[PDB]
DNA sequence: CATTTAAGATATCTTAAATG
DNA sequence: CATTTAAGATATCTTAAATG
């Protein structure tokens, strides 16, 4: 089964942005982004809202995916 | 002004339920209705979007209102 | 370079006791 | 009774160092 980590991770991939640049736009640090790629930690409530619209896609697909 | 667990307070009173109740709709703790509702933590990622679902309305608006 | 690992501060949860 | 307070375990962040 698929974790949010690498849904997060490929989506990052499609935008063509670096971790850093996806935390300037979370506003959370690229280890925090590096993190929840790898599955070490999930995002807050706060950051999974902002990491979600940054990402141009629903709070849900990124915990449940499809 | 207004903070997300003074939100959350109002929501699950418009339901007329106890934290309790709410708690097992949400998966956790009365405790950790509590918790929010005083504004003392605030849920995580997974427990964000449960708690939307359950009070019936979208996480942005518990977060910030609307 | 971009990312991961490590250490450490603090938030988010738990169950039990206390409160009203 | 419902809810809050207390104590405590694990999760979620930060910056610095390590990695490739
Ligand atoms: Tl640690
Ligand atoms: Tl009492
Ligand atoms: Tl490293
Ligand atoms: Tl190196």
Redesign the interface.
Known sequence: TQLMGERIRARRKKLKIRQAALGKMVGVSNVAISQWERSET????????ALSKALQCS??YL?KGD
Chains 1, 2 share one sequence.
């Open positions: 999930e995002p807050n409530g706060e950051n999974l809202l709070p849900d915990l």
